[PDB]
């Protein structure tokens, strides 16, 4: 049967290579049978009529297979979503031959997976034959698979299977870049050079992949078909530990389809989920959280930020988290920032936060939550490991009352892990501020704390009571090695604050910027003066000063001029002052004398190419400065006017920094 072969190889292409060809009788509706030749390639089987010339009657890919039922010996049936085809062959020595090849390919691709697991259903009634097979698969050796758990070989088969054009680019990227980097993350934005539709075979290839433990995309709006494939992977993958689809414009239906996949999956490997950016809208979240409740593993990290949750959503979710016995011992990161925590019962949230738990990072910011209520829970729950707590943009109480419960001071007295605290953007009246600061001073267990109070209205607050509000007073302050008090609108009252800080031995980084809005000159100088005194004191613990975005203009010089003789600060941010060329001339002299500044942040100062030049000159003689971020905004303007002199100088500056 030669002439009958070519005609075939002429319809299926040459090289493609066919490792088996067979004659078989396709069992067909109407108790009719039809005569066909069957051709076995590496990913794909074909059925063509025995006639010359051959038509192509039926094709199915080994990935297509749902089951095979064999039963009577010469008879093979294979089932697939498209259709199930029954077949009569000369001998069983022929079917076991056909199944031996298919399970061999599947072993060949798909390292680490039994070829039975792959074609879901395999039953031959003479059972001993099957057994005869499993070893046979066992019998042949497997060459170590290629990079990333054989991802390239699988991608190929999958493209052939779902009808996509195998992109060399994907193979190169995985075999070469991924391999060097030893990443176990598939990042859809690596494939941004291919078409959108082109991700489909790439993602679907992960269902049997045992390399990759993380699938991630951010800021890519994902197409309905791409999602179909993410979901399938989540349904079937025992190996996938982390899903991140961020700002993917997924919505509520996807939320539900994802609940679906997880329910469906007997053992998920998923402990980390980030879906921030997407409007899951509670119902999707409610749909998911139920699943989250019962997961084999319990959640390590969950980010659902800006998911368009309301209190009803957060409550449903938190109740689901505390449902799962594990989340308390497994959950180290919870980000619910950007949804609404205000005006809706949240009892289940405060309740979950309250059961002692392993959470390290809690982010409730721009949730408008209640500090007094959240602090109430953390106190019971989170003393042990919370370390970073972001609570910015929130109203101390939802109550109209002014008491500040003891739950609030007590927490900061009692925490053993706090290291980062952000209350920025929340009005703190004198009483709550006093509780918080007294609580942290009262705390030995903490050391190295960093507190962001920027934009807290400490101005209206010091004017209001204050003057012992820091000098609370008995303890202060050894706890806090970084503090940002910018944008509080201290104005003059900044002096009060400066002195309190100069009696302080802990604080290594201080940010004061944007506290100087319009101020009488007679007023401002005295503050900047105290500020110099502090910088210049021989005991100053301060390594970093930020005057950023002050809008001081000419007057920052008095600071900048101190910098020359300074020996303590290793970083300073003078950005955003409008200091101009005169400021830069002065900064440059500072840098000609000064030996201790690692980094200086200068942009938005309206510096001009002439200015840059003075700085590019100081640097050739300054060997200690290592970082001086390029003034993007000032340069771009500089470029409008003397594009030539400006580029020359900023690159001169960059060379010298690079050399240091």
Domain residue extents for the chain: 1-106, 107-150, 151-660
Interatomic CA distance for residues 361 and 334, integer angstroms: 6
State in Å, rounded, how far the first CA of the chain is from the last one: 78
The CA-based dihedral angle spanning residues 164, 247, 346, 349, taken in that order and rounded to the nearest 10 degrees: 70
283 sits in the region (left: phi over 0; alpha: psi -120 to 50; else beta) called alpha
| Residue of 507, 519, 445, 417 lying closest to 470 (CA atoms) | 507
Interatomic CA distance for residues 645 and 617, integer angstroms: 13
Tell me if 490 sits within 8 A of 457, measured CB to CB.
no
Angle between helix 406-414 and helix 430-441 axes, rounded to 10 deg: 30
Rg of the chain, C-alpha, whole Å: 34
403 sits in the region (left: phi over 0; alpha: psi -120 to 50; else beta) called beta
Element (H, E) at 62: none
SS3 416: coil
Tell me if 298 sits within 8 A of 273, measured CB to CB.
no
Distances, alpha carbon 286 to alpha carbons 340, 415, 417, in Å: 15, 32, 31
Chain centroid offset of residue 48 CA: 50
Give the dihedral sign, CA 370/373/377/382.
positive
Phi, psi of 234 (to 5 degrees): -65, -30
Element (H, E) at 219: none
Tell me if 510 sits within 8 A of 501, measured CB to CB.
yes
The CA-based dihedral angle spanning residues 588, 592, 595, 599, taken in that order and rounded to the nearest 10 degrees: 30
| Residue 461, both tokens | 């607050």
SS3 380: helix
Write 259-263 long-range contacts (CB < 8 A, 24+).
Answer: 259/284, 259/287, 259/288, 259/290, 259/291, 260/231, 260/235, 261/231, 261/232, 261/234, 261/235, 262/234, 262/288, 262/291, 262/295, 263/291
Q: What's the full length of the chain, in residues?
A: 660
Tell me if 110 sits within 8 A of 101, measured CB to CB.
no
Q: Is the peptide bond before 563 cis (omega within 30 degrees of 0)?
A: no
CB-count burial class (<10 Å; 0-12, 13-18, 19+) for 505: exposed
Phi, psi of 485 (to 5 degrees): -115, 25
Interatomic CA distance for residues 59 and 16, integer angstroms: 15
* CATH class, 1-106 region: mainly beta
Distances, alpha carbon 410 to alpha carbons 231, 369, 439, in Å: 45, 19, 6
151-660 belongs to CATH 3.40.50.11540: no
| Residue of 110, 101, 20 lying closest to 63 (CA atoms) | 110
- The CB density around residue 138, as the number of other CB atoms within 10 Å, is 10
Enumerate the β-bridge partners of residue 422.
390, 452
Interatomic CA distance for residues 217 and 262, integer angstroms: 19
Interatomic CA distance for residues 324 and 338, integer angstroms: 25
Strands 65-69 and 75-80: antiparallel
In the block, tokens 């025992």 appear at 238
CB-count burial class (<10 Å; 0-12, 13-18, 19+) for 571: middle
In the block, tokens 């005194």 appear at 533
| Residue 8, both tokens | 């075939």
Tell me if 485 sits within 8 A of 520, measured CB to CB.
no
Give the dihedral sign, CA 276/281/287/290.
positive
Angle among Cα 656, 657, 659 to the nearest 5 degrees reads: 65
Tell me if 560 sits within 8 A of 574, measured CB to CB.
yes
Enumerate the β-bridge partners of residue 449.
480
Element (H, E) at 37: strand 32-40
Tell me if 280 sits within 8 A of 307, measured CB to CB.
yes
310 sits in the region (left: phi over 0; alpha: psi -120 to 50; else beta) called beta
The CA-based dihedral angle spanning residues 168, 172, 175, 179, taken in that order and rounded to the nearest 10 degrees: -150
Looking at the structure, give the CATH architecture of the domain made up of residues 107-150. Answer: Helix non-globular (6.10)
Angle between helix 283-293 and helix 311-323 axes, rounded to 10 deg: 10
In the block, tokens 């994802």 appear at 258
Angle among Cα 545, 548, 551 to the nearest 5 degrees reads: 130
Residues with Cβ < 8 Å from 410, sequence gap 6 or more? 379, 439
Element (H, E) at 601: strand 599-601
Residues with Cβ < 8 Å from 66, sequence gap 6 or more? 79, 80, 81, 119, 120, 121
Strand residue runs (E) in 385-512: 388-390, 420-422, 449-452, 480-484, 509-511
Strands 75-80 and 509-511: unpaired
| Residue 495, both tokens | 């002096």
Report how this structure was experimentally obtained. X-ray
Alpha helices in 324-368 (DSSP H): 327-330, 347-354
Interatomic CA distance for residues 431 and 402, integer angstroms: 8
CB-count burial class (<10 Å; 0-12, 13-18, 19+) for 518: exposed
122 sits in the region (left: phi over 0; alpha: psi -120 to 50; else beta) called beta
Phi, psi of 579 (to 5 degrees): -75, -25
Phi, psi of 243 (to 5 degrees): -115, 125
Chain centroid offset of residue 477 CA: 36
């Amino acid at each position: 049967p030669r002439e009958l072969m070519e005609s075939i190889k002429d319809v299926i292409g040459r090289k493609i290579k066919i490792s088996v060809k067979k004659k078989v009788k396709l069992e067909v509706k109407g108790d009719r049978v039809e005569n066909k030749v069957l051709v076995l390639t590496s990913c794909r089987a074909f059925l063509l009529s025995a006639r010359i010339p051959s038509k192509l009657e039926l094709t199915f890919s080994y990935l297509e297979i749902h089951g095979v039922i064999c039963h009577k010996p010469a008879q093979m049936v294979v089932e697939t979503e498209k259709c199930n085809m029954s077949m009569k062959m000369v001998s069983p020595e022929d079917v076991s031959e056909v199944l031996a090849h298919i399970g061999t390919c599947l072993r060949r691709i798909f390292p680490g997976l039994s070829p039975l697991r792959i074609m879901k259903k395999v039953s031959m009634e003479p059972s001993e034959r099957l057994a005869s097979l499993q070893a046979l698969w066992d019998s042949q050796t497997l060459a170590e698979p290629g990079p990333c758990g054989g991802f390239s070989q699988m991608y190929a088969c999958v493209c052939d299977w779902l009808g996509f054009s195998y992109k060399e680019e994907v193979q190169w990227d995985v075999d070469t870049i991924y391999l060097t980097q030893d990443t176990r993350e598939l990042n859809l934005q690596d494939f941004s050079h291919l078409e959108h539709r082109d991700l489909i075979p790439i993602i679907a290839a992960l269902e049997y992949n045992q390399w990759f433990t993380k699938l991630s995309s951010k800021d890519l709006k994902l197409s309905t078909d791409v999602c179909e494939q993410i979901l399938r992977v989540v349904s079937r993958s025992n190996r996938l530990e982390e899903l991140v689809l961020e700002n993917a414009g997924l919505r509520i239906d996807f939320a539900q389809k994802l609940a679906g996949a997880l329910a469906h999956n007997p053992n998920s490997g998923l402990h980390t989920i980030n879906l921030a950016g997407n409007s899951l809208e509670d119902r999707g979240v409610s749909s998911l959280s139920i699943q989250f409740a019962k997961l084999p593993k319990g959640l390590k990290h969950l980010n659902l930020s800006k998911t368009s949750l309301s209190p009803k959503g957060v409550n449903s979710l938190c109740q689901s988290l505390s449902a799962n016995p594990l989340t308390a011992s497994t959950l180290t990161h919870l980000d619910l920032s950007g949804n609404a925590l205000r005006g809706d019962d949240l009892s289940h949230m405060y309740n979950f936060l309250a059961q002692p738990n392993t959470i390290v990072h809690l982010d409730l910011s721009n949730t408008e939550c209640s500090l007094e209520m959240v602090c109430s829970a953390l106190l019971r729950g989170c003393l042990q490991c919370l370390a970073v707590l972001n609570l910015s943009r929130s109203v101390f109480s939802h109550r109209k009352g002014k008491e500040v419960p003891p739950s609030f001071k007590q927490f900061f007295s009692s925490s053993l892990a706090l290291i980062q605290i952000n209350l920025s953007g929340t009005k703190l009246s004198p009483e709550p501020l006093k509780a918080l600061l007294l609580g942290l001073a009262c705390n030995h267990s903490l050391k190295g704390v960093s507190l962001d109070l920027s934009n807290c209205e400490l101005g209206h607050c010091l004017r209001s009571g204050g003057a012992q509000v820091l000098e609370g007073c008995i303890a202060e302050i050894h706890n806090i090695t970084s503090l940002d008090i910018s944008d509080n609108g201290l104005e003059s009252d900044l002096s009060t604050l400066i002195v309190w800080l100069s009696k302080n031995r802990s604080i290594q980084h201080l940010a004061l910027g944007k506290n100087f809005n319009n101020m009488k000159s007679k007023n401002l100088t005295p503050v900047l003066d105290n500020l110099v005194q502090m910088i210049q004191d021989e005991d100053s613990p301060l390594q970093s000063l930020s005057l950023a975005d002050s809008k001081l203009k000419a007057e920052v010089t008095i600071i900048i001029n101190a910098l020359g003789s300074n020996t303590s600060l290793t970083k300073v941010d003078i950005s955003g002052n409008g200091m101009g060329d005169m400021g830069a001339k002065m900064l440059a002299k500072a840098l000609q004398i000064n030996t201790k500044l690692r980094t200086v942040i200068w942009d938005k100062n309206n510096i001009t190419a002439q200015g840059f030049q003075d700085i590019a000159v100081a640097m050739e003689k300054n060997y200690t400065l290592r970082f001086m971020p390029i003034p993007m905004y000032d340069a771009a303007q500089a470029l409008k006017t003397n594009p030539e002199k400006t580029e020359e100088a900023l690159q001169k500056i960059e060379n010298y920094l690079l050399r240091n």
